[model samples]
Each structure stands twice: as structure tokens, then as C-alpha cells.
Target chain A: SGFRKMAFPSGKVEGCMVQVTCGTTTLNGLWLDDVVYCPRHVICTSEDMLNPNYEDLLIRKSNHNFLVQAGNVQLRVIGHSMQNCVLKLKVDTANPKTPKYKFVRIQPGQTFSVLACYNGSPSGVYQCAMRPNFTIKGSFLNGSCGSVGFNIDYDCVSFCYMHHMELPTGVHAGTDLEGNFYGPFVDRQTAQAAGTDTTITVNVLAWLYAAVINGDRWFLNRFTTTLNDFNLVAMKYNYEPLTQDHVDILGPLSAQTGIAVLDMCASLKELLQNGMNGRTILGSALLEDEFTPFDVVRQCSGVTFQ
Target chain B: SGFRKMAFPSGKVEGCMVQVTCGTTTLNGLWLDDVVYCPRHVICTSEDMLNPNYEDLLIRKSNHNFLVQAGNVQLRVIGHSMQNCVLKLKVDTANPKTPKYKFVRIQPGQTFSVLACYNGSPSGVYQCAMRPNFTIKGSFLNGSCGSVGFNIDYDCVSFCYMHHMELPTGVHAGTDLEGNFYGPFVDRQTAQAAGTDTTITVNVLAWLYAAVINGDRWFLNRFTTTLNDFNLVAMKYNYEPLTQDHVDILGPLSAQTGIAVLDMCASLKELLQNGMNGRTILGSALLEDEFTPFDVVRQCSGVTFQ
Candidate 1:
């Protein structure tokens, strides 16, 4: 009762099947499409389902490339350009009683490089459909933009009177995706302030930083003398942050009733990957010197410390 | 000089080392706190500061359990009863630059079981030390109690109610731990409140009663309904609790972000396993007898005719 439809500029169908092959016959690269077949009425004559060998379908394109399946399928974009990209096909016939499936559809300018194999259950049928449609779009720069250099600055300034610390030379200070403060501090003081900036900051401060730097004898004396209201703040508010990089169980993410800590960490990892090295991070001025200031600022803002 | 203290109830020290060995002769089974060796001083002989596998000396126990470079160690108990328990052992290594490590002290008395593997990296460590100076405690669960046998009355009723509504059976209700609700229903309408006492009355309901009276369809329906719900809920929740019979992940546990759904299903499963019999289900109450005095209850409850 179900009929399939295919509309394209080229490629012909024979009865219900279509075949078109091209490329240097020696190279054996061709494209074919506009074909459909019905499988429900085709009864299985064999007692058991065909055991397809997926091992043979594996394709290695580069010298150092490996793929690990985290879930049912790994969606990989593999190609020198977008056109020859490999296809990641996942046909889940897990529920044999009611089969439902979808597959990767290459655009006009795209071609299937290879079909990735899945070691999981495959109770469904599949076919490789192709069509010749190619095009190109954009461009860009190359090579080193400048010259190399070296510098040695051993100027040690205690800066007893350096007030309202300007953003350090190499470090960075900015807002997070949620518009909260993030700091890459050259000196410990700016880091401490950034650490205590927001709910997330306080959480990271206590869990990731405080646990590591707590017993520093300099931290106590310096902050106490440099900041007059330290004792009152410590006593009155008793505000404390976690010092370990481990997930803070007391943080809002963890404190939420059934939220899994690992899941939260996973989400955070995604955020870091998405946001790191992006323009979201601003420059810092915490470095002791300006000799390597730009690079330091880039590192602090672009790199993911977590 | 760094001075650390150690107290042993009754153990001999040989060559600046205190060693404990498991005397179990047969090598088939795993043992608790198999063997431990503590040395007075751990000398650094290599430049590999980050390599934990590298040790100057090695202590080998049955099945390869022993401590190499050691430090002062202690054990303490915090929280809960001890029975075939997992113990926590805390090792105090004075130098972070050296091999700073801790051991968990597990005894046979406390009933503690490890849920996940610990890799030892601060960022990836999950294996927790338990009892007697446990340094890091991850997640653990007690062994499952024996399964509860199903009584016919309990089974029949619970199955009838849930099966008729096409809803999950009793076992899928809430995170039993905190008594929090995590409904598997797609929307709150079916979840809002139990339907009126009389809602759906039809001939099929009469057939259900006849099936139950004849002791054939009733049993088959009950079992099928329960099994369907079991599979559906288990798949939906993506986590299966450790049962008396199995320790496995029936679904995608790692990918799940919330434990509430799993908890609810687990609770329901436990109730079913406990043989409490049938109970009212929000959606599955249509299977009651159509002409019976209680037929009006199904009608009031809004059972569909289709």
C-alpha cells in the first residue's frame, strides 16, 4: 500500500530498479538514484536472518584516524571536501514488530565516500543511492603571518602599592556563556576574585581551586592584611568554596534532586568544547610582564583549563 | 622533619615494612583487602614523577595484590553498619610531588559493593576507598535481597488495572529512595489524577471478566500486560537496578541525565516483585467487567470505547 517517490534532474529507472555507473571504468566511481523497492511482501525463505559481516565495511581514510562508538551510531564528517564525505548510516530494526528507519541523504554537491559499519543489530535492508551533482563555494589564508622573537624580562616588582589591579598582561578576564565572569589570572589574587564571582564561579572556586590552594600560608596573611574586611566577611558570612576540580555535590547542578553528576559533567564538557577558543573569552591583565602578553591572554581565554 | 604516626593492633614489622596477607589458599575467588604493605620511607629513584605504576619495591599477594612504595596508613569508619562491608583506607603521603596515594580498608563485616570502576586519575577516579580511613568514597550499593514471590490475588489485580489502561505496571512509580515522583506518562492529563470510579464500560470489559473467571485469559493477559509494562518501563528509564538474579545495564544508563525515571520504574519493579498484587493505574483501568456494579467506575474514569 506504500509507494516511494524520487525526483531528480537525471538518472533513469528500469521497472522499479535503477542502475547508472560512471567514472574512469578503472577508477570505478559512478552515481545512481531514482529507484524504489517494496520488501514487506518479499517473504524470507531462509530460516534465520542473514548475518551481515560489518567488519568488511570499515573504511580508513587517513594515517591517524580512529572512531569509537559512544552510542548507537557515530555521526562522522569524513572527506577531503564536503562532496566526497563518507556516509554514517544507522538502520535500526530493533523493534522487528514495527520497523521504522531513516538514512543520511547527501545534498546535490555531496557524494558518499563510504558507508560506516555498525556492529549492532541490523534487521533491516539497505541500498546505496547515488546521483552526480557537484559544486564548490569558498576560500582563505596560509603560512606564518609574522617573524619569531625572544625576550628575557626578570623585573620582579612586589607592587606593594599596585591597587585595583589592571587586567594582568598575559591573563584574561571575561564572562561565561551565561554572562558570568571568567578569569585567567597570572597572580593568585585575580583568580581568587574571579573564583568567587558567581554561583558557578564560587562552585568552581571551592571545588576546583580552594581544595588545592587552601593551606597556602601566603593566602591567609596577604588577603587579611591587604583587605581590611576579611575577618568580618569570613565570620559573618562564613562563605566557603570547594577546592577540588571534582564535581561539587553541593553545587546547584548536583543539589538538584535526581540530576546525575556525571551527566552534568558531560554537559559541561560539551560546553567547554563549544565555547573554548571562541571570542566569548576576553583579555586578562594578570601576567607579571607584557613581553608575551598576547599569547598568554589567548591561552587563558581560548584554552579550557577544566 | 615530617613525623607521621601509625598504630597497629597486632602486626609484626619486618625491614621497615608492615605487610598484611590474605591466607586464602584457593585462587578462584576475589578477596577483600587481599594484601597491603606499608614502608617507613619510599625513596624516589626515577625522574618519572607522574608514573604511578613505577615503584622501587613490589609486594605481591595471591592473584597479585600488594603495595609497593608506601607511607603511614590508617583506617576509620564513618556512617552505617559494617557487614561484608567495603572499607575505606586513608594513606597519608606527605609529599605531593612523590607518589601521593591512599588505600581503602575493606573488611568482611560491612555489606558494601562497588558500583563503578575507579581509574586512579583525579579527573577520572571512581573507585572509592571505604571504611577505616577511606580516602575517596564513590558510589556503592548493598546486595539485593531475595526476590519476593507473587501471590495470585496481588498479581491478578495489579495486572488487570495497569494492563487495561495501557500504562506501566506498579513497579514503575517513583524513585523509592527519596519518595520522589517521576511519571513515565507523556503528559500530565493522564497523570493529573486518577479517573472517576466509573468511566469506560464496554463488551471487551465483559470479555476480560469472562477471561479472568475462566482462569485462562486473565493469567495470560496479566502476564503479558506485566511483561509489556516491564519492557516498556525498563526501556524508557534506560537503567535497570541490580536484581537478586542479575547485575547489568538493560538500557543506556550512562546517557541518561536524570535518575528520577529509573528510580520510579525500579520502585514499581520492586513492588511487583514483592507480590503486592494489582493496584490502580492512572491509564490502565479499562479491563474491569463491563456490566458489573463497579462498571460505572470505569465509565466515570473516562475509559475509551475504542
Candidate 2:
């Protein structure tokens, strides 16, 4: 005989009729003729599978308005409009087929910050969309609004450099997380124009000195990005395209290697500007500056540049 | 029975053996049947299809030497060595199946320039290949030297901006295409170093002002790319990795918004340098500078910033 009751997770059972079929013969809402007939019983009314819009309807009624704030490559979202709403956030929507969405539940006026560090796209854009739904809210209510979007723009090249250097994400150059001062992070343009560029460069150098003394990887990324940016500007000025080859040459400059690579890049710029004859000029500049791969080895052997 | 002779595009027919099959019987180079029952079927001999080298032979005899010059993204090719040589030009090779190849026939020293405006890749590289053959040269001599390659690099961001703005492709700010100068396209670094930096800014402002006055969508693409580049720099300086969020924001700056967005961007750099407290400073700066979404609205209201 087929049982007429089935138990679910909520510890409740619903009594429903069962149909038993054997070969071409079928019994409707009847007990089986034999004990062996239990295998033939089937639950014909699978409610969830029968309705295609069952889940969609559940998702349609959820609260999803949010306010976004970004700092130090970190994104924070506050549930501003709905109480106890489930917010699904996807940081990058480039690949919509399989997106990584972070889920958070926030009471009205409460904020949810992602624990993972957020890295925006290398192309200099960051986009995240949030959707709120009642099913996510753990409620049976069916009122969900469309998704809300947020965008932030930051310095991508600098970010990539800093990230690669493994420095603190959201901290500024002028002060540490604990609010200790290293020096003012002056604007290159403003400082240079005001004739106070020495102080700014000194501040940067001091920071680099500290990082080097501490054997930290802190300034490497910042320096590399700056160098790369400088090289890009130089290349553009010289009527040259920034190629993969140029990027490759600029990629390895670090504090350990000092300004040797920078000297090379600067010389390279002049060479490019001068056309074919500039290579000869570049050779002289290289020799005069003593900027070469051998400088790294020489420094390792306690040799000093004159 | 089938006829073995086939006509080709070159007006030539070649004879070959034909195979005939009837029921379970097969015969090679033989025809047998009742005159009333057997009818002659012709399969035009496809000489080129049968011989793999037919097309190769045709191409080998064609003239293929060329001289290429690129300006304003337009490519010009001269069949300088051979008369009536076929020049097949593939502009954008990104799509293989439906390539935009322009064919031209040129005698010795004759030049064929693309009538259409050529837009190079944003990566500052444009590649195309040309084949000199009968299709282009209208010659039968198989002297063509396969495909010849061409590459050009230019200010792609500026080009894209000019392109979108519907400006002339090859006109420089202060110079004519023929090397005559209405003015000089002075360097930013050179001007800044000479303490005449305002001239550079003035140049940019002039360009922007003209674009605005013309109601042109000028510099949107260029500004976006530059802003994206700046954001990249900021992200790097801030020790943040370039993210899609950053790119998403940078992708939208345009001529309609004008220098207001740029001023905001400049402030953003300061905020980034200032660290946590910079956000407050940025807020104060925004309020002090009156930079907000309302600025965009004001621009729409026809109130302009000088």
C-alpha cells in the first residue's frame, strides 16, 4: 500500500492521494493490491517543478535599494530603503553567465562591507550591481525592485602598482593607518609649479628610505607605477606608442635597482626623439649615467656610482 | 552516361575519364545502355577544383611589389615595380570571413589610396596586408610576391576623439598637413619647465572651448581615455588595483560635462593623497569648488564655466 502522507523540513506532513501503476494498468487514488506494489506508487503532483514562475515570483518581491561608498579600493553598501532586505552584490558584471555575488542582509539604515579586498578593473572602472529580494530577505512577501548600480573611478595604474607591491590598500601617503605622519603627499604639478618640488620629492624619498631600511616592499610598486607613467608620458611626447616591449622594460624598475632604469628610460626617450642618431646619443648618456643592468650587480658588490 | 568535359571561368575545357554506375554495375571510361534508355549527362569539368595549384599558379604570375604610406589613418599603396598589378587590401583583419578588402589595379608608379576614411585600432596599431595579382593588377604574369604587410601608429585616443567629433583626421593643432605651422603644438613639459605652463592649459582649453561652442561631442572619447589613464595613475598611487568600477566611471567623461569633471578628477587626486581625512577634504573641496552632479545639470541649463 502507498502512504498518503509525506514529511518535509518544516516537520509538517500533507495528506495527498497517490497513484499506483503496474504495466498498462493504473490505479487512481487507491491502495495497492499487493505489498510488492509499493514500488509502483508515484507522487504525481510535484508542486515546484509544475510551475515555472514559482521561483521567479518569489524573487520579484524583495527590497533592494542601497547606497554605495568606495575608499581604498573598498566598497561598502548600506541598506537604505528596506528593512531586513537581502542584498546580492556582484562587483564585476563583465561575465554575466557566472558572476560571483556576495550576499548580505542588512536592517534598514545598516551597512554591509565586503571583507574581501576589492580590485577594480585595470581599464580604470569599477562597477557593482545590487539586487534585493524577499526570498533573500527570508520572507514570503513578493515585492522586489529592479537592481541598483554603483560606479567608482580611481587611479588604476597606481592601484595596480600598489597592489602588486602588497601595500595597504586604502591608506594615504601622508599618514599611516594609526595617523602618524611621514610627510605631506604633495601634488606633483602644484609642488613643481610653486618651486617647492624638492620638499615633495624629499618626502617621497624619505618614505622610500624608510621602506628600504625596514626591508619592506612598500615603495616599489608606487615607484614602478610612477616610473611607468613617466615613461608613458615621455613616449607619447616623443611620438612613440606604448608597446608591450616598452611595458616589459618598465616593469622591473624597483627601489633596489634605484634610478638606473629611470635613467635608461629617460635616455630612451631622447633616443626616440632624435630618431636613428639618438641611439648613439643614448649610448653616451648610458655610459655617462652608468645606468645599466650591471649597476645592480655592482651595487650588490658594494660598488658606488660616481 | 556522363560527358567528361567541363568548362571553367577561364573559358577552357579539359577532358577526363568518367565513371558510370547503374544498379550494381560500374564502368570506367565506358558507356553501355539501350539508346532509348541511356541519356547523356554533362558534368562541366571543374579544372581549377581538380588541380589544387590552379589558383596558386595564377597568383604566382601576378606582380606584387608595392610601396605603402599612411597618414590620417589613410593607407596609400603604389605598385612601383610592376604594371597592372592587383592590390588587395584588407583593412581590419579582426573578422576573417567578411574582411573589408579594397582591390585596385595600378600601373608602375601608380598609387591607390583607400577612398574610405581608415580608423586604426585604439592600441595605436593598424595592420593591413596587400596582394598584387590579376584581380588587382589585371595582369597574367605570375610575378606577385604574396601579401605585403603595412603598419601605422598614431595618437589613437586623440584620433578616436576627433573621429567621434567628426573633425578632420590629419589636422594638427598648430600645424598644417604640409608642414606649415599656424602655430606650434607645444609640449606640456617643455612649456611647464619654461614657466609658461598656462599656454599648454590654454591650448587644451581652447580646443575644449571650440568643441563646446560647436556643440560637438568632441573630446569625450579622448577625455574618457585620459581620465581612465588618470584613474589608472591614481589607483596605482593609492596602492589600489585597477578595477572595473574605476574603468566604469572613467568611461563616461565627455565634452558636455567639460572641465568640471576634470576639476573633480584633479580634486580626487588630492583626496587620494590625503588618505582617510581626504574624503572630508574632498567633500569640503566639492562644496568650496561647487563640484557636484548639479554642475552637469547647470551645463544642461546653458550656464558655462570659463
Candidate 3:
């Protein structure tokens, strides 16, 4: 016996297959849904059943952050937006079966930060590693376990602001979607920082208005669309490489929640090209009387603030 | 004869009655739907199609702002959430039939700023007067002909940043929800500024990060709930009565687009209580090291920053 699969969105999607047996009922990994189905246990024969990745790709590490910064009042991620991804809190890692942070099981915009940050207390820099869960990778938050730092400052500060933080010595590595696992790139700084060590890793998830990793200090602006996906993108300007200046958590300001980074994929071509002249803003290298959000300038070399 | 009505959701809603006749077909206002139905008519005797409001309230100018600051990229109001209200661009005003700035006719985040702002030029203080259409009243961007100044700054600044603007001598006055047209109230400043002409109006809709309208400098903090309603609350700390410091536009930080102000109103009891320790922030009297996103402190007479 195998698990029955739910209807999956039939669109521009690719595929694969696998299965496993759970008691009398066998379980199957539905390629379209990117998840496993287990039948009710009636105590039948034992089995490894099967596990498959629609595209049969190993969980690859990708450069992206997928949490919806609906603000401190609520924190969550959408399943459709992260189907190619998955998320887990380091604090909740102990209980392998994350009934809480399982993601897909929750509603869109659900405030499932239950296991994330207890009402207060253990406040500091916390990492909520996001990516795809193994076996079930129907494009939910699955890529590689890219780690983002969320500072739950309860002891000293009271807000959970995303800060420019050091990556965990053992945190997963990322890239501009390059390399064997989307790492080890072409550019010297970006490659060495991202693929190799924590040098170039972009951290765009700072407090909705400010998120960072150890590298050029990436940020996620709001939505490029109404969902969470298009909200994640990259880039930072002259701020000592490791410094924080002209960028407000570069993502999210684009639109709403759970669109996609690479797909529901609204745009980068615009933000990167037009320049953020308003919020999701970093300080401006442009004149104070000029546009405020941000634009290239003397700070970025040839692009003078004049 | 009357107009054919569409299927409306059967739920909690009040009622009224009115009708109008079109050419070959006579159109009717469906109370359940808050809209007038138009029919394929025979040139019938001229008739005044009937109209109504669910709660039977006139186009009351209540204290509220409903446009979603989805950022400069997209701008539009949701229909269902705004059934009780409506919107229009003064620029598109000359023509009585506002096909351009009509709120109900567009999709949830449609970006119908067509007649609202041109790509560039003529950039100054522009008011997008939001309220309900005289005939339709579902719970929309309705309320008062509440005026919000959206600065289209391509001329000097190049970004549409909201500033502490003066109320339009003719802008609909406001109150926390009092008096005729929601104006003239109890508190000296807020009431005077909002209800009185030009003197003390509380403007909370600045650019997403900073909005104001004179008075004690009211600001809308993001969502107290996901949609727009609960996110719209009140209170201003101690800045010169007409100054700008600790409040970002004061609204929208709580969650996504259009909900309601007086209803679906998840809360006021919460935000006005716990305080915004993060964003949708106004400055904090609390202490740089303390919680931000605005809380009471020194500047406020009794509460000291220490």
C-alpha cells in the first residue's frame, strides 16, 4: 500500500519518483508534490518503501533566505513559495520531527514561530536554517540549508532585529546559484566568501529592514510581488564589505509574502537596474537632497555621489 | 424591473433599499453585495437607481487611511476589504466617472495608480482621497473622504516620500471617530488638528516608513493583524506638536494589504498596549538600548527617558 498524493499544481514543473513502506501501508514520494505519503499503519510487512526527488537532485545549497518578516508580532514562511525549500530552527533541531516548523502543514502567513523564539528570555543571535527537507522536495523551502541570523534581543534589546552577524562555524555555505552545489563561483570575492568560507556569503534577511550574513551584507527588500518568493534578491554597496550602511534588509520591501527567489521570480533586473530610491533603504551615497533609499555613488567607486 | 444581481457571500451584514433604471435594462443595488446591478435596458422612463449602505451609514468621513503602501512600485486597494469604502485621485477628478482611480473595480493589489502619478513630472503633494462610492458600500476603502498626501517627488527628490504636510484647506477633517465628518474632538491637538480646519490633524499615512498630517504627528504602525485594519491605531509620543521624529508612517508594518479599520479589527488593545518594539516605528522615548518601534518615554511629560 502507498500513500495517496494530494493534487499538485500542474504548471511549469519537472519530475521523478520513489517509495517506502510504513507498516501495512507503503509510502510514496510524489514527485509533483515533492513529499512522502504514508498510509495508516495496519502492521504489515516492513519496507524501505522509496524516496525520490522529482528531479532526483540531492539537497543542494542555494543562496537565499525565505522567512516572511511580517514583523516581530509574527514570523513565518509560505509553503508554495518555498516548495523548493524548507526551514528549521537551530533551537528546535533537537526534535528531528519538527511538527511545529514542518512549514507545509501550516497556513499561509501562519505565525508558527512557536519553536523559534519562546515568548522572550533566550534572546541573542539565533539562526533559522532554511532549505528543502530531504525526500520531500517539491520546491518548498528546499535548496541547501542556508542559515540566517535572527537576533531575539530580549535581555538587552527587546526587538528581534536581523543583524550583520558571524555565521555559525558549522552553518551551511551558499553561492550565486553556482558550483557543484551552487557554490565555488567565478568571481574571486563572491566565490571565496560564499562557496569556500563565510567570506562572501550574503545575508539579506536582517530584521525585514536589515538582514545580513558575513559577506557584502546582503539584504532582502519587500516583495517584488505579493508573495514571499520574489522578495528575496541580492546586492550591497561600499560599506567596508563587512560594514552596514546604505541597505535596509534588501528584500521584502518589494511586495508581500512567499513568492519565490528564482521563480515566482518577479524581478532583480529592475531593483538592480533602477535603484531603490525609497525604503528597504540603506543610507544614500546619492546626495541627501537627492533620492534617499539608495543608488550607486562615490561610495561605490566610479559612481560618484555628485 | 430591476437589475440581475451576482452571487454574494451570505454572512454578517446589515441592509437598505434603492433602485435606478437604465436604458433597456433597469439596474438595482444589491444590499448583500453593496453594489448596483445594471441591466440591458429598453429606453425606460428616467429613474433614480436606488442605493444603500450595509449599516445604513452615510458616506461618513471616519478616521482612517486604506491605501496599501506596497511601496512605490505598486499601489491599489482590495475590493472586498474595502466594500465599505472607495478611492479616487484628485488628478483624475475632473471627470466624474473615475474609471482610472476607482478602488472597487480593480484587483486586490492591482496598481491602478494610472491617473494617480505619471512616471515623472508634476511631482508635488498629491492627495488620493479615499472613501466609499455613493452607491456601493461593502466594507471597502470607505469611511471618510479621508485625505492622505502622497508626495510624488520626481521634480526635486526623485522618490515619493511622505513628509509632514499641511492638511488641504478643503481636505475632509478627521477624528478618532467622532463628530460630524469625524472631526472636531476632545484632545486639544489631535482633535483640533484633525477635526478643525488645518490646525490639528493627525496624519499617519506618510511613505510606508514615514507618514504624517500635522497634529501631534500621528503615524500608522504596521499590522496589529495581517490585513490593514488593526494596523490602523493611534497615539503619538512627544515631538514638537507638529514635528517628526519617532514615528514611521505609523501603519502597515503589522501585515499585508486591506483589511478594515473599525471591523475585522483584530485589535487596538494589543498594539496600544505591548508597544511596537521593532518597526512601522516612530522614534522611541524608551531608550536607544531599550525596545524601539516606539514606546512611551521622557519626552512625554510624565515618562522620562531614563
| C-alpha local distance difference test of each model | 0.19, 0.20, 0.19
Per-model TM values vs. the true structure = 0.16, 0.18, 0.20
Structural RMSD, model 3: 22.6
Provide a comma-separated list of chain B TM-scores, one per candidate.
0.16, 0.16, 0.17
Give the Cα-based TM-score of candidate 3 against the true structure: 0.20
lDDT of 3 by residue, A241-275 (tens): 21222222233422333423332223332444465
List DockQ, one per candidate, in order.
0.01, 0.01, 0.01
* Fnat value of model 2: 0.00
Two-way TM-score contest, 1 vs 2, winner? 2
Q: Which candidate is the best by TM-score?
A: 3
**What are the per-residue Cα lDDT tens digits for candidate 2 across B180-239?**
211232211122111111111111222232234334332233222345565565545532
Candidate 1 C-alpha lDDT tens digits along A160-256: 0000112322112211111112133221233222322112222222221121121211111111111223223323332322123324433443443
Q: State how far residue B75 of model 3 sits from its true place (Å).
A: 24
DockQ score for model 1: 0.01
The ten-residue window of minimal lDDT in model 3 chain B covers B1-10
Model 3 spans > 4 angstroms off = A1-306, B1-306
i-RMS for every candidate: 35.1, 38.7, 28.0
Best by lDDT: 2
